[PDB]
Amino acid sequence: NFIWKGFINMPSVAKFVTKAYPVSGSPEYLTEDLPDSIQVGGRISPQTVWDYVEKIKASGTKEICVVRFTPVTEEDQISYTLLFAYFSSRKRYGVAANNMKQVKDMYLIPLGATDKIPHPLVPFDGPGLELHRPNLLLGLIIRQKLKRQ
């Protein structure tokens, strides 16, 4: 199942619809906690500003929910690729500006072909990403627990 379907809008440049699939959180109903359109507020220094995720981790098998985005239409895939191309070229991450209900901060991570997988997210605990991937935009959010029902 897709956990969330909705828009990812960076004004003018990338505006598109995308489905969100779990990568490092247990998937059981979280569409409640997310709006329909995600406005991209700006940027953040990914290569150094790992530290905020590191500051979050207190325990042993602690997850912050990380999802991958797939565009639903051939049309969405162009805008998708533009937003990816936008951040990947500049070596920055996207940041969401929208009223964040229980989410404090949310980030879009352009993941292309990395030899070492961005280290501070790799321990997934639950699902995970495949080795044969396209260029992917990931959503960085919050989960805790695993098997819900």
Side-chain angles (χ1 to χ4, degrees):
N1 202 15
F2 78 96
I3 305 309
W4 178 81
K5 175 193 175 157
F7 266 82
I8 293 179
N9 169 12
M10 189 155 195
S12 193
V13 42
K15 303 146 271 121
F16 58 90
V17 183
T18 27
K19 298 195 286 162
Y21 289 89
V23 175
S24 185
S26 170
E28 219 75 38
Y29 320 132
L30 181 141
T31 324
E32 155 75 274
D33 296 273
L34 299 172
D36 293 354
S37 179
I38 293 163
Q39 280 291 143
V40 176
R43 47 168 215 85
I44 188 92
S45 162
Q47 304 272 47
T48 318
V49 187
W50 296 124
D51 314 297
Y52 179 45
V53 158
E54 290 226 287
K55 286 164 124 74
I56 287 165
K57 279 167 57 181
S59 41
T61 174
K62 170 93 81 80
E63 317 89 329
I64 53 92
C65 198
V66 51
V67 301
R68 87 162 200 279
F69 297 125
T70 62
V72 187
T73 299
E74 201 187 309
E75 278 218 357
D76 293 313
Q77 176 205 275
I78 182 57
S79 324
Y80 190 103
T81 45
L82 269 53
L83 204 46
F84 184 93
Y86 186 90
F87 288 110
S88 184
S89 292
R90 8 238 80 118
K91 288 209 168 180
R92 332 288 148 77
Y93 290 1
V95 185
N98 320 47
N99 289 116
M100 287 155 275
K101 208 145 163 134
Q102 175 174 114
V103 60
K104 190 57 233 67
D105 292 69
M106 174 190 160
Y107 301 83
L108 277 81
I109 303 107
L111 180 62
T114 58
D115 283 22
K116 226 157 165 195
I117 303 105
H119 316 87
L121 310 94
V122 279
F124 291 141
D125 287 337
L129 292 166
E130 195 189 317
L131 185 265
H132 204 236
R133 314 178 310 255
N135 279 157
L136 276 172
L137 290 167
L138 293 95
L140 180 71
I141 334 173
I142 304 98
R143 260 186 212 265
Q144 74 88 53
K145 276 199 172 183
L146 208 77
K147 194 145 188 142
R148 321 153 146 202
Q149 221 163 306

